[PDB]
């Protein structure tokens, strides 16, 4: 199926507490592969997935030097933005940046991204087709004019459409054993007496990869939403994901309800029903 | 692999 590579950067000012904090994480699909934290002792970009450790010293030296340059630019931006907004010298603020690319099933470029946020709100971002900028306010307009004089959009697209897609493919191949693995969900259904006239049915989907999945309830063959609860997809902690959907039903009528599970790892969607 | 050059806001 589709694939993506993405880098997430977070910088937080810490008034009277040293340099701001800088954290960088890298992901391929739903798998983190690299890390950098300005407070850790190593001061190295570090591996977080097995396949990336096959890269040599030049790679790690280069990625470390690039992520450090990145931390230095964000440390400056924190001061610039405070200036644009005429803000607190001793107040804590946050700058986030995300960039990367999406490729289809055949591994060909689909789209790219480069977005920036200040204090959890959109600041400036490249539009969907990468050919122009979206600037939130007068401050972002100041950034936008500087970025257009330096031809930043063009610099990024060269990376987002070429280099980014080239490394995503390199990683997917080297880490094929885990990155191109499809782990169908292990499923089951639980049953609890809620009260004198009700019973709860909980449909589970466990140990699945990638995270994209669909859990739904039907009653008498028709979609059911009344008295239902669907939790956010969550990480198991071992590289896999979990998710569940529940429904409250009248006691004695639980077999009229069915749970449908759709995931890329299943050659055919599964249908669960309460079997006492 | 990370982007190498980043322009300040």
């Amino acid at each position: 199926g589709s694939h993506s590579m993405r880098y997430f950067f977070t910088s937080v000012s810490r008034p009277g507490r040293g340099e701001p904090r800088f954290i960088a994480v890298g992901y391929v699909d739903d798998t983190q592969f690299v890390r950098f934290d300005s407070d850790a002792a190593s001061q190295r970009m570090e591996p977080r997935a097995p396949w990336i450790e096959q890269e040599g010293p030049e790679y790690w030296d280069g990625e470390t030097r690039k992520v450090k340059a990145h931390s230095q630019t964000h440390r400056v931006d924190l001061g610039t933005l405070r200036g644009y907004y005429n803000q607190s010298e001793a107040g804590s603020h946050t700058v986030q940046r995300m960039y990367g690319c999406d490729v289809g099933s055949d591994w060909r470029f689909l789209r790219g991204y480069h977005q920036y946020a200040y204090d959890g709100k959109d600041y400036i971002a490249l539009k969907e087709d990468l050919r122009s900028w979206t600037a939130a306010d007068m401050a972002a307009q100041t950034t936008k004019h500087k970025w257009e004089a330096a031809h930043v959009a063009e610099q990024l697209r060269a990376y987002l459409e070429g280099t980014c897609v080239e490394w995503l493919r390199r990683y997917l191949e080297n880490g094929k054993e885990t990155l191109q693995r499809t782990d169908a969900p292990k499923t089951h259904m639980t049953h609890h007496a809620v009260s004198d006239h009700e019973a709860t049915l909980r449909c589970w989907a466990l140990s699945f990869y990638p995270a994209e999945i669909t859990l739904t309830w039907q009653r008498d063959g028709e979609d059911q939403t009344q008295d239902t609860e669907l939790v956010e997809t969550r990480p198991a902690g071992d590289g896999t994901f979990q998710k569940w959907a529940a429904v409250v039903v009248p006691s004695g009528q639980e077999q009229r309800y069915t749970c449908h599970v759709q995931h890329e790892g299943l050659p055919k969607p599964l249908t669960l029903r309460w079997e006492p | 692999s990370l982007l190498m050059w980043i322009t300040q806001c």
Epitope: R65, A69, A150 | W5, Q8
Partner: T-cell receptor, first 114, second 113 residues
Framework: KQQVTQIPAALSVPEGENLVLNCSFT??????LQWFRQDPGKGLTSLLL?????REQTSGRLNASLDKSSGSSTLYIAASQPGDSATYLC?????????????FGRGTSLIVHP | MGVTQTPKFQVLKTGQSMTLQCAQD?????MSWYRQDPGMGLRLIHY???????DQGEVPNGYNVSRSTIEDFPLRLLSAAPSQTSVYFC????????????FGEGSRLTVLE
């Protein structure tokens, strides 16, 4: 690895002549190309700055372009003057290597006779 | 404004230590030091892409640098030797924008026995 070559190495001409100095590089993946001037016993003065997205720049009688064949740049000096005499250095910066280190050529020593 | 190197000239005795200073007020992430002997080319000593980060160039032997603030990048000659007689240049830039390099005026050191 990047190698910057500048031809001609030395250039001696009468004033008023239009000059063409060349700066070629082996690794076309560059972030920028910068031309400088250096006179004997003095520092370096930046003259022009070009990039793959802003391929030409002009400063008076000087203009440099980042040629179509992605491995060369030309510096043009119109109506040369004895004041133009100096060593012209060209340097490029990397777009992908993760080091950011510039690579300089050996320079072109120019003498413009009055 | 721009890049300021100090001192511009200096005479050292063999074995003395010396620190050359270099400051910039442009918020440049990148700072570097070069040496260039008379009529020869520029040789990179050390450079820095960020505070707390330094790396070696072509000739780091006999020199030390530190980057504790974004503005300053001092070059320390540990123990002066006659072979360190040269012209030293500090150069800085943004690691973005145009990447344009900005050179200081130069520092001329002569080491004598």
């Amino acid at each position: 690895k990047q190698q910057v070559t500048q031809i001609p190495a030395a250039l001696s001409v009468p004033e008023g002549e239009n000059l063409v100095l060349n700066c070629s590089f082996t690794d076309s993946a560059i972030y920028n190309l910068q031309w400088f001037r250096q006179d004997p016993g003095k520092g370096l003065t930046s003259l022009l700055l070009i990039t793959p997205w802003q391929r030409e720049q002009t400063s008076g009688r000087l203009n440099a372009s980042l040629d179509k064949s992605s491995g060369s740049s030309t510096l043009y000096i119109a109506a040369s003057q004895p004041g133009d005499s100096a060593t012209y250095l060209c340097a490029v910066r990397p777009l992908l290597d993760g080091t950011y280190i510039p690579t300089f050529g050996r320079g072109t020593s120019l003498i413009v006779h009055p | 404004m721009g890049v300021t190197q100090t001192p511009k000239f200096q005479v050292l005795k063999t074995g003395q230590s010396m620190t050359l200073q270099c400051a910039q007020d442009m918020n440049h992430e990148y700072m570097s030091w070069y040496r260039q002997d008379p009529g020869m080319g520029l040789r990179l000593i050390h450079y820095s892409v960020s505070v707390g980060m330094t790396d070696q160039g072509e000739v780091p032997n006999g020199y030390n640098v530190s980057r504790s603030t974004i503005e300053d990048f001092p070059l320390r000659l540990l123990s002066a030797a006659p072979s360190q007689t040269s012209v030293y240049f500090c150069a800085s830039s943004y690691l973005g924008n145009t990447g344009e390099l900005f050179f200081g005026e130069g520092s001329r050191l002569t080491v004598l026995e």
